[PDB]
């Protein structure tokens, strides 16, 4: 009877597999490719300036 952390490896593999499934689904439906027509909108984001003192 030596020491044992097989349940630790199973738990860590379960965490890795569940996180890989969720992140694969999110990176599947957020960086998809639009088809035959192109990007149907535009980003249009612009940043203006401010008056920032320097004390």
């Amino acid at each position: 009877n030596p020491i044992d952390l097989t349940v630790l490896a199973e738990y860590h593999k379960q965490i890795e597999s569940n996180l890989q499934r969720i992140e694969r689904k999110n990176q599947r439906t957020w960086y998809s490719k639009p088809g035959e027509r192109g990007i149907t909108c535009s980003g249009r984001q612009k940043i203006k300036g401010k008056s920032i003192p320097l004390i």
Partner: protein, 49 residues
């Protein structure tokens, strides 16, 4: 009920009854127009990556 008001069959009223079901299928065509509009409006967009 004016359309289904019974009267002796002339050829003109029967052809105009056929034209009455032709506006019925035109009404079906307006229904498909409404469906064509709502599938455009309801559906989400594509965007930039």
């Amino acid at each position: 009920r004016w359309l289904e008001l019974g009267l002796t069959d002339e050829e003109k009223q029967n052809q105009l009854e056929q034209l009455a079901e032709q506006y019925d299928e035109l009404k079906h065509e307006f229904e498909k127009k409404l469906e064509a509009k709502r599938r455009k409006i309801t559906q989400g967009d594509d965007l930039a990556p």
